[PDB]
Amino acid sequence: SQELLKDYIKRQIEYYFSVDNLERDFFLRRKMDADGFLPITLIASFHRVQALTTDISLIFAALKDSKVVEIVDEKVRRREEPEKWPLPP
RNA sequence: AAAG
């Protein structure tokens, strides 16, 4: 239910952080810090996430269950080699 | 926002 909506959110954000997307997503990489982290609230603004929910705790909850991304406080990054992706602003 |  809300579990179902969490699964859709999780898979959507897991796409953003997939290698297939990252190879062409220059905006996302320009917003990374040098460690690969992005604000979760920036992801929350992306059209396909905001369509599903504007509930920030639901977005956090969806991502805690992810093996693709890791959360530190308010930021999220790809778990595998995140430092390879950031680009100059 | 050609799934930023």
Curated annotation (Swiss-Prot):
Domain HTH La-type RNA-binding positions: 2-89
Induction: Up-regulated in a number of hepatocellular carcinoma cell lines and liver cancer lesions, as well as in patients with hepatocellular carcinoma with a lower survival rate (at protein level).
Localization (cell): Cytoplasm; Cytoplasmic granule
Source taxon at top rank: Eukaryota
Entry PTM: Phosphorylated on multiple Ser and Thr residues in response to active mTORC1. Phosphorylation is important for interaction with RPTOR and the mTORC1 complex. Phosphorylation promotes dissociation from the 5'UTR of mRNA molecules with a 5'TOP motif.
Domain-related comment: The C-terminal region mediates interaction with the mRNA and polysomes. It is required for translational repression of mRNAs with a 5'TOP motif. The N-terminal region mediates interaction with PABPC1.
Functional note: RNA-binding protein that regulates the translation of specific target mRNA species downstream of the mTORC1 complex, in function of growth signals and nutrient availability. Interacts on the one hand with the 3' poly-A tails that are present in all mRNA molecules, and on the other hand with the 7-methylguanosine cap structure of mRNAs containing a 5' terminal oligopyrimidine (5'TOP) motif, which is present in mRNAs encoding ribosomal proteins and several components of the translation machinery. (Microbial infection) Positively regulates the replication of dengue virus (DENV).
Family assignment from sequence similarity: Belongs to the LARP family.
The protein's assembly and partners: Interacts with PABPC1/PABP. Interacts with EIF4A1. Interacts with RPTOR. Recruited to the active mTORC1 complex via interaction with RPTOR. Inhibition of mTORC1 activity strongly reduces interaction with RPTOR and the mTORC1 complex. Identified in a complex with mRNA, PABPC1, EIF4E and EIF4G1. Found in a complex with PABPC1 and SHFL.
Protein name (Swiss-Prot/TrEMBL): La-related protein 1
Species, as recorded: Homo sapiens (Human)
Lineage, uppermost ranks: Eukaryota, Metazoa, Chordata, Craniata, Vertebrata
Gene of this entry: LARP1
Residue numbers of the full-length protein present here: 400 to 487 of 1096
